Curated annotation (Swiss-Prot), chains A, B, C, D, E, F:
Gene: FTMT
Protein name in the entry: Ferritin, mitochondrial
Subunit structure: Homooligomer of 24 subunits. The functional molecule is roughly spherical and contains a central cavity into which the polymeric mineral iron core is deposited.
Domain called Ferritin-like diiron: residue spans: 7-156
Shown residues within the full chain: 64 to 236 of 242
Locations listed in the record: Mitochondrion
Length: 173, 173, 173, 173, 173, 173
């Protein structure tokens, strides 16, 4: 107290990083739920399953990089419960994509608030960390999900019988 | 009488294995019938044909492993007629998949009854044999057929003109 | 009705091909029975087992080529029960070989009657099919079985203790 | 309702599998917490960190295989909150190892109760699943942790200055 | 007391595993005795020698896997004298094969009793261990020895001068 | 009677070789016991385990070469019970090493007495056999064990917490 490594690292930043870790672990859990929805016998869209499983594992990576940052800067990781997702039954490929898009925008908003806090606290290391590893990743993710939602809507998902099947095999395959 | 190899092998188990051999050979014949239905000039779904031909050959493997078990344990194989399948004309890709699912559940029920008999007779070798080579294979097969039935139903098979054609080329291809 | 592919294909030929399919599947089953007789603990002639298992699989090939022919010509496959073999206990390597020789001659006679029918119906495609894929195969098979029976008889099978053992390891190995 | 795949799968088993999924995800989170404790600047045992991170990822694998089983059998995954671990500060390499050993024994007890339930419900597929993928894994894990605890105790951890350092570099390296 | 690893492991099971270790070491010694009988100048059947030496080494493997199990589960290995085999002079290749068959059936009976005890004590780990590594190995071994005894009897062993010589060179070579 | 191969081979030598075979098999069993002591969860010195397991297998080799010698010279192998080791709990790495050193010196004394007997009986083949394959092996083994005991004593085994751990990983690893 303080850590021999700690320098220019505000307690508010440390707390906000702990909250961000929880949010990234939550996002991982949401995607894991979606992945296994798509492998149900009455859904059986294996490339939607693979896509969301990959997203789940990326969110765990996002959480771990923040945990590493906490240690690097001499903060102390404080974990909290990972809340269950809002749904187990995700309804359709389109609905899951729309929910993922909303999730990603929510996580983006949290990251932008974290960047504003880091700026306020004169922490350019933390600002750069977020810019380098988080903000463009989020923009790319949101854009990709937007593209997917548009194609599924235009194709007639979820009610048009061929739409999710064909998107599964040609876009996500 | 008895075989110099026979040990802890109840006559009821020996008889039940003979009945299971017949059922696996019957399942092989059903799938062979389906395979050649799909190669008719007025059906011509070559990947449905290939899929069911593969399933036919797997069922022969299942029969042979039970025949080998009978010899290994010192029982005597007693073959019976292999009954013809219930249909020659299987109507559609969806109908064949639904019939295959029912067949697999029926074969599964027979295997579960065989496991219950082996348990009752204190035959852990036979229990393990069924668990190792049959029960999970059946669960996997039933799940795969369930997945296929769901996709074909959602796509609008059998009446939607593109459904079986597209499933043939993208899932079974 | 008729199939858009059907041409110069008599209903009698179509029916005779269905009967031939059943006979080839029956021959496969006979050989499968023999194969597993030779793997009994009280018989244990592993190369006799392998030899008859191979013959079993070849007969399934013979059945499938006729099933393909039926579809190619626009006929409709009509499957029937596959009758069990005449024996489960095949007595000896010599007896099995003698039974196989009789089976092959019986199947040959059926093929010759099928060729006579095809000739009568002016079906040169069917005549050529039988000549190309069946008649010489049968002559080769009958000759091979004749050779095997002669050697086993001369060697003193089944009662001479070394005969089947030595034939198993030097001719069939 | 029910799933077209469901067979011999009791609702109690389905519920117990959902509880087991939560427990495996909890174990993953415990190990993740431990991994990042060991990377603190005031702990800095990088091979303890790597060891627990690996264990964390294995527990996620354990959770996923149960999620797959639920879908395979036609049950429905029902996720719950993942509770935070009991500690963020794990005190020492020895204490973390002792906590991991207790966790593994607790998870083992849950698996044994699940196997007893599956047995009671006559579900040999579920029994075999647990035996094949879970029970021996748990015994191996408990034994390994026991070995590690013994060596650390004998070496004088946590107070002997060289003990955890040397164990980190020679056993876990 | 108890071992920090021990869980769901009954003292009766621990004792029965110690007895099984002794029996497997005894079986190894029997086979070692047989191997060196066949290398006598007045026996000189080098492939019978090699066959039994291999079986001896496999039995040591069986003993070691049980010793490892004892440690894995937190039991304590308690070794006893390894009794000498019943004979040094094994009389003939046929007699040795018949003695080996009886030995294997006796060891199998002991394993089945061990499985019944494990079942009674609700130890699915131990049941699976026996099923996975012991019970099918025993069935395979008994069947192989049955096959060998049958061929040697039919060939006229031990009195027919060529029988053991030819079996040595063609089956065991 | 006598063996057609026997020449210059005294009955006393034949008997002494049988006693030596038993002693080498006993030494193998002692080392096997030690190997599995070191794999206990409350000992867990895996390189001590590996070292003694290797020594166990070498002693079996020593026994087999004497069994081969007996046959080569036309003597008859006479096996006896293999007595259990003096301990199951070997107390420590140092104590096991000290017990192994005493065992090796005892086996050496027996070999020297065997050489004296062979000399007395004018058997230069047996003298050379012992010199070539046994006497220098024993001197090397005794020296190696002496080296190990010295290092463990100097390092402070068994009570110094780091000693056996460090010797396990740097000398025996
Ligand atoms: Cl600071
Ligand atoms: Cl809350
Ligand atoms: Cl700044
Ligand atoms: Cl897209
Ligand atoms: Cl559509
Ligand atoms: Cl029996
Ligand atoms: Cl009937
Ligand atoms: Cl049982
Ligand atoms: Cl599908
Ligand atoms: Cl359509
Ligand atoms: Cl398409
Ligand atoms: Cl026509
Ligand atoms: Cl009839
Ligand atoms: Cl013509
Ligand atoms: Cl021939
Ligand atoms: Cl003869
Ligand atoms: Cl059910
Ligand atoms: Cl709660
Ligand atoms: Cl059950
Ligand atoms: Cl360790
Ligand atoms: Cl220290
Ligand atoms: Cl216990
Ligand atoms: Cl006694
Ligand atoms: Cl149990
Ligand atoms: Cl044999
Ligand atoms: Cl002879
Ligand atoms: Cl020969
Ligand atoms: Cl002499
Ligand atoms: Cl005594
Ligand atoms: Cl001399
Ligand atoms: Cl040394
Ligand atoms: Cl020390
Ligand atoms: Fe939050
Ligand atoms: Fe992504
Ligand atoms: Fe990625
Ligand atoms: Fe993220
Ligand atoms: Fe909640
Ligand atoms: Fe994200
Ligand atoms: Fe930048
Ligand atoms: Fe992303
Ligand atoms: Fe039946
Ligand atoms: Fe399949
Ligand atoms: Fe396959
Ligand atoms: Fe099957
Ligand atoms: Fe019928
Ligand atoms: Fe099947
Ligand atoms: Fe079981
Ligand atoms: Fe299958
Ligand atoms: Fe017929
Ligand atoms: Fe052939
Ligand atoms: Fe062939
Ligand atoms: Fe044929
Ligand atoms: Fe009949
Ligand atoms: Fe034929
Ligand atoms: Fe021709
Ligand atoms: Fe042929
Ligand atoms: Fe729980
Ligand atoms: Fe692990
Ligand atoms: Fe691993
Ligand atoms: Fe786990
Ligand atoms: Fe809480
Ligand atoms: Fe675990
Ligand atoms: Fe199993
Ligand atoms: Fe583990
Ligand atoms: Fe015993
Ligand atoms: Fe073997
Ligand atoms: Fe082997
Ligand atoms: Fe054994
Ligand atoms: Fe005795
Ligand atoms: Fe054995
Ligand atoms: Fe064996
Ligand atoms: Fe002695
Ligand atoms: Fe050595
Ligand atoms: Fe060596
Ligand atoms: Fe030795
Ligand atoms: Fe004693
Ligand atoms: Fe030695
Ligand atoms: Fe020399
Ligand atoms: Fe040595
Ligand atoms: Fe070192
Ligand atoms: Mg300082
Ligand atoms: Mg603070
Ligand atoms: Mg998938
Ligand atoms: Mg007998
Ligand atoms: Mg009977
Ligand atoms: Mg085709
Ligand atoms: Mg037309
Ligand atoms: Mg007609
Ligand atoms: Mg075979
Ligand atoms: Mg339905
Ligand atoms: Mg329910
Ligand atoms: Mg690290
Ligand atoms: Mg304790
Ligand atoms: Mg006790
Ligand atoms: Mg040899
Ligand atoms: Mg003479
Ligand atoms: Mg004498
Ligand atoms: Mg080891």
């Amino acid at each position: 107290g303080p850590s021999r490594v700690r320098q220019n690292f505000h307690p508010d930043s440390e707390a906000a990083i702990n909250r961000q870790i929880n949010l990234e672990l939550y996002a991982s859990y949401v995607y894991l739920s979606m992945a296994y929805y798509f492998s149900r016998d009455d859904v059986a869209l294996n490339n939607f399953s693979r896509y969301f499983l990959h997203q789940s594992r990326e969110e765990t990576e996002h959480a771990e990089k923040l945990m590493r940052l906490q240690n690097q800067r001499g903060g102390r990781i404080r974990l909290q419960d990972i809340k269950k997702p809002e749904q187990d039954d995700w309804e359709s490929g389109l609905h899951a994509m729309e929910c993922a898009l909303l999730l990603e925008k929510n996580v983006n908003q949290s990251l932008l608030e974290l960047h504003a806090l880091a700026s306020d606290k004169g922490d350019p290391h933390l600002c750069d960390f977020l810019e380098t590893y988080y903000l463009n990743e989020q923009v790319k993710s949101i854009k990709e999900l937007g593209d997917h939602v548009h194609n599924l809507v235009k194709m007639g998902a979820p009610d048009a019988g061929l739409a999710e099947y064909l998107f599964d095999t040609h876009t996500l395959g």
